[PDB]
Amino acid sequence: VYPKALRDEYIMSKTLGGEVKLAFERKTCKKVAIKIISKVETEIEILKKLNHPCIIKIKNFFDAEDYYIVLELMEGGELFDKVVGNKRLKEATCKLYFYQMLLAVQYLHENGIIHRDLKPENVLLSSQEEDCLIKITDFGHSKILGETSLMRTLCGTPTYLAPEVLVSVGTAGYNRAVDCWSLGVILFICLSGYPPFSEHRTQVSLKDQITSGKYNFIPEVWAEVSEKALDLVKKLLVVDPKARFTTEEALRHPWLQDEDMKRKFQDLLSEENESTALPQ
Amino acid sequence: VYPKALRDEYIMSKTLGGEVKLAFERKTCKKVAIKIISKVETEIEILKKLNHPCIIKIKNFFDAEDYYIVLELMEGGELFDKVVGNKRLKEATCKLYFYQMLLAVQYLHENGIIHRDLKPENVLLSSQEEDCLIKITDFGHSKILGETSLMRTLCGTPTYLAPEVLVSVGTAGYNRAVDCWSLGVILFICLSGYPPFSEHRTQVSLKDQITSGKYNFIPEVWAEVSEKALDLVKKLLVVDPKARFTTEEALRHPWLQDEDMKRKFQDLLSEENESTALPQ
Ligand SMILES: C/C(=N\NC(=N)N)c1ccc2[nH]c(C(=O)Nc3ccc4cc[nH]c4c3)cc2c1
Numbered sequence: 001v002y003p004k005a006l007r008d009e010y011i012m013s014k015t016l017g018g019e020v021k022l023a024f025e026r027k028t029c030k031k032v033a034i035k036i037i038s039k040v041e042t043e044i045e046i047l048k049k050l051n052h053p054c055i056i057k058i059k060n061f062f063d064a065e066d067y068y069i070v071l072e073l074m075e076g077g078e079l080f081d082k083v084v085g086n087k088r089l090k091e092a093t094c095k096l097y098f099y100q101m102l103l104a105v106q107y108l109h110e111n112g113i114i115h116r117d118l119k120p121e122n123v124l125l126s127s128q129e130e131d132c133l134i135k136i137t138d139f140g141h142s143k144i145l146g147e148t149s150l151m152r153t154l155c156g157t158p159t160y161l162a163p164e165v166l167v168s169v170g171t172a173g174y175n176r177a178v179d180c181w182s183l184g185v186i187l188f189i190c191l192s193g194y195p196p197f198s199e200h201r202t203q204v205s206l207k208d209q210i211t212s213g214k215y216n217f218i219p220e221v222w223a224e225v226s227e228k229a230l231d232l233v234k235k236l237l238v239v240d241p242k243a244r245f246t247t248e249e250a251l252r253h254p255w256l257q258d259e260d261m262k263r264k265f266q267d268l269l270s271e272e273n274e275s276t277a278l279p280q
Numbered sequence: 281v282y283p284k285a286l287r288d289e290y291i292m293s294k295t296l297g298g299e300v301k302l303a304f305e306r307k308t309c310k311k312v313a314i315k316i317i318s319k320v321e322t323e324i325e326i327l328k329k330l331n332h333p334c335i336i337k338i339k340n341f342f343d344a345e346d347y348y349i350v351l352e353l354m355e356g357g358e359l360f361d362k363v364v365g366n367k368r369l370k371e372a373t374c375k376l377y378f379y380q381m382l383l384a385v386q387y388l389h390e391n392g393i394i395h396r397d398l399k400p401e402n403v404l405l406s407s408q409e410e411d412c413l414i415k416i417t418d419f420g421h422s423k424i425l426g427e428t429s430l431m432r433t434l435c436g437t438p439t440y441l442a443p444e445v446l447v448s449v450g451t452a453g454y455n456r457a458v459d460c461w462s463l464g465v466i467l468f469i470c471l472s473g474y475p476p477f478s479e480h481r482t483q484v485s486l487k488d489q490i491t492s493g494k495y496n497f498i499p500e501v502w503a504e505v506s507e508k509a510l511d512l513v514k515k516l517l518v519v520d521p522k523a524r525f526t527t528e529e530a531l532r533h534p535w536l537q538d539e540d541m542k543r544k545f546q547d548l549l550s551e552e553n554e555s556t557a558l559p560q
């Protein structure tokens with residue numbers, strides 16, 4: 001059965017997609033989504049402190065036989081369902097969604113959080129309309145940046161310190177780049193309807209495809225996509241994490257300098273919000 | 281002032297060497313050492329669970345204005361004081377002490393603990409006699425091995441996973457090798473009376489000396505040391521952490537196949553212990 005404290009506040013309903021259930025908050029008679037994780041504490045603390053229009057908000061939490069995370073309901077479901085079975089979005093729709101993913105992840109990295117599991121299943125859409133807000137979810141693998149062991153190590157004289165630790169200094173502090181790579185793979189899929197690295201009709205192992213950076217490029221699928229969109233993908237799918245585009249660099253890329261797209265996003269934000277009166 | 285709960289149980293005395301104070305446990309009238317760390321929880325939990333004759337034991341803990349760690353008193357003081365100012369130990373004494381450091385660190389790695397700050401200041405001697413027991417201390421930088429993020433990452437399909445993470449797999453799980461490198465540096469110092477890497481009369485930076493593995497070799501100091509002892513040092517001061525000797529490999533090295541040394545250690549252990557009667 002559902003835990004009593006959850007029942008006290010919510011009426012549970014149908015499965016939306018771990019499971020995600022529709023529920024109704026009794027107080028408001030409004031819909032919520034309830035993520036059930038079978039037996040997270042850090043994920044909750046992260047979700048509670050973040051405040052961005054493209055990051056899912058937590059409404060409630062119950063730690064019982066299973067975990068119950070109560071969230072705002074995103075009516076449009078998961079991005080995965082828009083791109084599965086070779087389905088692909090209009091380039092303009094890709095740009096609107098990708099811009100928002102970039103804003104969200106930029107906000108995470110500014111706030112010292114790396115997501116580490118960005119994928120279409122973790123991108124939620126606000127409605128069944130093509131032009132909609134998106135929100136990232138699932139901080140179950142996310143890492144909080146703070147002062148490292150390495151930093152403390154480097155404060156003393158390395159008389160006794162192993163060479164591999166001094167070697168690691170060249171690359172330390174780029175862990176956030178893994179999110180930019182996943183973004184690149186998401187963008188590749190949204191624009192083309194097929195993954196850049198996979199075992200479908202190829203002899204090269206998945207690992208080798210990825211570490212070499214040699215994505216599967218099929219000209220015929222890509223001919224209808226703009227040069228600028230592909231140029232961004234290429235800058236994100238860079239094997240060297242120090243050379244890989246950051247979210248700031250991606251947000252400055254020509255493909256994203258799109259006044260009409262940005263207007264649409266601003267309009268959608270305005271429509272979402274229920275603000276109080278304000279002075280002047 | 282000292283915290284009341286500490287005063288209740290102990291009478292505090294002179295400074296031995298953060299500070300380390302001599303104190304007397306009131307209950308037994310016996311000497312203890314009290315490490316004061318100015319404002320650790322993990323260090324205490326580690327110290328409480330470890331049980332090896334060459335690892336310092338915790339007797340008590342007080343979390344007050346400062347931390348107070350009550351330990352067994354090692355009358356011989358720190359190894360640092362035996363090797364400072366170019367002083368150097370007889371090779372036989374080096375071997376007896378190094379054997380015990382190896383046993384201690386082998387026990388740590390078997391138990392999923394990496395020390396990460398091995399140095400002469402953290403090696404304590406049981407008496408002012410040359411032939412004595414040694415115990416490692418200071419787990420303030422120590423790391424507890426468990427299931428990694430990497431392990432969980434590798435359980436799924438790396439469709440979205442960044443190449444640097446797959447690259448890291450080749451070297452993961454050798455973090456314990458940093459202790460073997462520090463051991464090598466300790467052994468180098470004990471045998472020679474001088475550090476292998478330093479800025480004394482040289483143009484090469486300390487970092488470069490270390491990452492290249494090019495220790496300062498002075499033939500005249502080393503002529504009186506055995507070939508076998510230096511051979512062990514060389515196998516520990518190996519730049520590649522996957523090729524570097526482990527504690528098991530070091531314990532199997534010819535230099536440590538010394539029946540007389542091992543007999544001395546066994547005799548010293550026997551002398552330390554106050555056991556109860558036993559059956560048969
Ligand atoms: C917070 C979280 N996971 N956390 C962990 N796994 N630790 C998570 C992951 C995936 C999620 N998906 C959703 C979500 O609302 N999904 C969803 C699925 C189908 C439909 C259909 C209409 N709206 C839907 C929403 C919430 C959600 C939360």
Ligand SMILES: C/C(=N\NC(=N)N)c1ccc2[nH]c(C(=O)Nc3ccc4cc[nH]c4c3)cc2c1
Pocket residue numbers: 296297298300313315317320323349351353354355356357358401402404417418419420421
């Ligand atoms: C547990 C610990 N440090 N932990 C942390 N810094 N977090 C630590 C470090 C160094 C230490 N040194 C000693 C110790 O007993 N030192 C010492 C110093 C001088 C003399 C002279 C006679 N006996 C001595 C013992 C205890 C001890 C504990």
